[PDB]
Design a protein around this ligand. Structure first.
Ligand SMILES: O=C(OCc1ccccc1)c1ccccc1
Ligand SMILES: O=C(OCc1ccccc1)c1ccccc1
Ligand SMILES: [Mn+2]
Ligand SMILES: [Mn+2]
Lengths: 256, 255
């Protein structure tokens, strides 16, 4: 069976698990929005006990964050256009959606030359000319190697807001309507470009993906370790009551 | 590849995914300890915006809880016996540990007749007579259907503390030393029995599992959906800096 073979390959290393997750840490950057709006929180942790009088044989912590802190998953109810999608919160998404095929589009060269690099229909067509049609119900990850930025260059805020790569409205429309993807993931804090408020419609990845019942992943790491095709993504969010998203441990299984 | 077969089996329904997780909810019970100790927090959530003046096109929340709230994973650094284990925190555990074979020992009939039911070496031996030995580096789940208890029946507190099933020290030692298991999971708030402070050593599942660099799962649901053998568990904890555990979404793939 595929599962018996999977177990054997995982045990030998013929199938490797790549962790695509950043550490949840108080100093890891989170999305910043215009100052009139409520803001995403940083991760925070505090000891309950540490093998001391408060708990002599154990150590454990209280934790707090936002649904959108760190490496995290976006459900359709996160956007106003997804507010009527069935199974639209993280606690209702069917579990078969948490494991599936993934394709990785390498935009790292373009992102190194232009902070506002755009994933376009033409680039997707170029990718499919080499790797074949994107399979139905796949995750599509836009690799940029942005996850290697370790300071203020990660959010990359300028006077008019953040400058980071993302998809155009036409790219997202193509992936949804012509390829029926499961979701879209990036290495930045947004599935939209940093300047995505100025597309038509604003924040088109969010507006269109979630309006169509599709999912988002943000702040992925280590996409340069993945093949363009053939890997399997594990992206199971926390089962938050009526939740719009969650931090999560994103993994890819890779044949090697 | 074994991955292309998996993808097409998930798409066709030949492979199914069972969710083994309880919803994170302020009302779901969390572990309660003697009152002189620090306590686990309940899950809490509050809106940042809900398509409103605070965020006109989006809805999202702040959340708070403990590492050990809800369906959750225990890393070896959670116990004092785990102090000298390498890679003992949830952000350091090798990722291959997060997907693996699982076996399920059905103790539901015993738990229905004894709140303090004990999984013993004898019960494990009976299971192995039927199913063959527990595979090396497998997750072992003690099924009790305790996850069907709601409200106060789930913690099941009495004047002498909580009454819920769990393993004996000898059962855990057998699984670690003779079968080299990866970890142990239950449908209760602890990998130990509710009255497990009274074993030698106290809380032996925690003490022995984490002292051996092994993992725990607690508050699992839906274990009655799983076969005794052949399923694959997905249990990937949040990547908390130096974390001792985390809430997580536990799943099982079943053929
Ligand atoms: O990603 C969106 O902003 C795009 C973006 C991308 C990068 C940085 C900042 C913003 C977003 C997410 C949640 C709420 C509102 C907007
Ligand atoms: O596993 C027990 O507590 C161990 C423990 C001690 C301190 C912290 C975490 C875990 C347990 C089991 C059932 C009910 C209550 C407690
Ligand atoms: Mn988000
Ligand atoms: Mn715990």
């Amino acid at each position: 069976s595929s599962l018996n073979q999977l177990v054997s390959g995982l045990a030998s290393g013929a199938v490797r698990i790549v962790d695509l997750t950043h550490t949840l840490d108080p100093d890891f950057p989170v999305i910043v929005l215009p100052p009139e709006f409520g803001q995403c929180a940083r991760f925070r942790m505090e000891e309950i006990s540490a093998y001391d009088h408060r708990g002599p044989a154990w150590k454990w912590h209280n934790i707090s964050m936002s649904e959108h802190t760190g490496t995290h998953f976006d459900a359709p109810s996160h956007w106003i256009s997804g507010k009527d999608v069935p199974n639209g919160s993280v606690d209702e998404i069917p579990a078969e959606a948490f494991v599936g095929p993934v394709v990785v589009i390498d935009c790292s060269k373009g992102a190194a030359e232009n902070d506002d690099f755009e994933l376009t229909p033409e680039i997707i067509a170029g990718w499919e000319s080499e790797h074949g049609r994107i399979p139905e119900d796949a995750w599509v990850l836009m690799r940029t190697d942005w996850s290697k930025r370790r300071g203020a260059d990660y959010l990359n805020m300028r006077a008019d807001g953040p400058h980071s790569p993302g998809p155009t409205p036409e790219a997202i429309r193509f992936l949804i309507e012509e390829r029926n993807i499961r979701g879209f993931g990036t290495e930045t804090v947004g599935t939209d470009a940093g300047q995505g408020a100025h597309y038509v419609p604003p924040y088109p990845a969010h507006y269109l993906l979630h309006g169509a019942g599709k999912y988002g992943l943000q702040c992925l790491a280590n996409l340069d370790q993945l093949p363009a095709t053939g890997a399997v993504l594990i992206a199971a969010p926390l089962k938050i009551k009526n939740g719009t998203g969650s931090p999560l441990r994103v993994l890819a299984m890779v044949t090697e």
